[PDB]
Structure 1
Amino acid sequence: PGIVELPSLEDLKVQEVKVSSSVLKAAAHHYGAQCDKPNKEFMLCRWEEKDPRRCLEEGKLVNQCALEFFRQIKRHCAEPFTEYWTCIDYSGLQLFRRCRKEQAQFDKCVLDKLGWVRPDLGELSKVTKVKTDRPLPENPYHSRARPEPNPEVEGDLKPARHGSRLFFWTM
């Protein structure tokens, strides 16, 4: 068959979000609130293209919008967030329920200094509508022409010509 078409190594270079998983999980609800739009454009492009190579640029927007999410935490509320992801980082299963006072301090400092509302129980699992200008992929499976089906039956059913025609049976 054909050559697989991969992007080059310079096409994949982007400033990564070089933080740990507890830093991400501690900031997760405000990330799902504030970084909604490029993330949903990316995941819509990701389920519609069904090909990561056609989803790189939108993905870079994700990696553009996450970092600006953290710098805006780093410029204003670096220390309550630092205590909060440290307390999240202690636990094995990384429980939100073991760290409610640092969560309250972080949410209070964020709501005062930046004006972000933490999403409630039920909001981040909603299915939202996304306004994009990219075209809908007309063939995301790279399929081809389906074969022509067999012709159907039509016409009124006439009786059998001279019956069964089985050797001598005249009916």
Structure 2
Amino acid sequence: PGIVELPTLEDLKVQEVKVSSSVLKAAAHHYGAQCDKPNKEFMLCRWEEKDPRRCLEEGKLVNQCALDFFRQIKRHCAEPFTEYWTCIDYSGLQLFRHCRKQQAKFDECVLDKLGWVRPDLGELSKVTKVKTDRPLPENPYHSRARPEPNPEAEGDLKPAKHGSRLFFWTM
């Protein structure tokens, strides 16, 4: 019943972010601080459309924004960041707690170079609002038409006509 439509392999081609988990964890706070708008646009579209095929352009946009962020990092603060993610990669749990010194070095370097302020506790978990021009989907669930309800009879009760009318009983 129907044909499942899939985008062509050309639509799924994009310049991937080829950095490992340790680099991403080291840069995550500033990445969320700087790249918030495209990420929130993509995620709002993702929970509104409920369809991966409807959110490809926003994924390409977030890839581009992450690429720009990492290009700025490479341009300005390469070696403090390298030491910081060297820490993060050494640990088996990838804990922030172990070399706060290198974290401070990277933070002061980015503050001096790009004027970036690291978000505080409880800030990246906030629920924000997104100004988007994408129209709100009207039937994201593709629901059918609901069956009509029962007639819902109503009125004033009258005594039973000739009572129970059960066999010989007159009441």
In the superposition, the TM-score normalised over structure 2's length comes to 0.98
Residue in 2 aligned with 1:73?
73
Q: Give the Cα–Cα distance (whole angstroms) in 2 for the partners of residues 66 and 114 of structure 1.
A: 16
3-state SS of the aligned residue for 2:86? helix
Cα deviation for residue 76 of structure 1 reads 0.2
CA distance in 2, matches of 1:168, 1:35: 86
**Cα-to-partner distance string for 1:32-66 (whole Å, 9 max, x where unaligned):** 10000000000000000000000000111111100
In the aligned structure 2, how far is the partner of 1:13 from the partner of 1:71?
20
| Secondary structure at the counterpart of residue 130 of structure 2 | coil
User: Which has the higher mean CA deviation after the structures are superposed, 59-68 or 158-167?
Assistant: 158-167
Equivalent position SS for 1:38: helix
Residue in structure 2 matched with residue 145 of structure 1 by the alignment:
145
Rounded Cα–Cα distance in structure 1 between residues aligned with 2:27 and 2:40: 18
Q: Secondary structure at the match of 2:96?
A: coil
Structure 1 CA distance for aligned equivalents of residues 105 and 152 of structure 2: 71
Q: Distance in 1 between matches of 2:119 and 2:162?
A: 79
Q: Which residue of 1 aligns with 2:17?
A: 17
Give runs of ≥4 in structure 1 deviating > 2 Å.
none
Cα distance in structure 2, aligned partners of 1:31 and 1:158? 74
The percent identity for this pair of structures is 95
Deviation per CA, 1:93-151: give whole Å up to 9, x if none. 10000121110001100111001110101000000000000000101111111111112
Q: C-alpha offsets along residues 14-42 of structure 1, whole Å, 9 cap, x if unaligned?
A: 00001000110100000110000000000
TM-superposed CA distance for 1:163, in Å, is: 1.3
Aligned to 2:103, the other structure's residue is in SS state: helix
RMSD: 0.8
Specify the SS of the correspondent of 1:44.
helix
SS across alignment from 1:22: helix
Q: Which moved more, 1:23-32 or 1:154-163?
A: 154-163
Q: Could you say what secondary structure the match of 1:119 adopts?
A: coil
Separation of aligned partners in 1, 2:137 and 2:170: 62
Whole-angstrom distance in 2 between the partners of 1:168 and 1:111: 99
Matching of residues 55-74 of structure 1 within 5 Å: 55-74=55-74
User: Which blocks of at least 5 consecutive residues in structure 1 are unaligned?
Assistant: none
SS in 1 for 2:151: coil
Point out the more displaced range, 1-10 or 153-162.
153-162
Q: Which runs of 5+ in 2 are unaligned?
A: none
Q: Post-superposition shift, 1:153?
A: 2.8
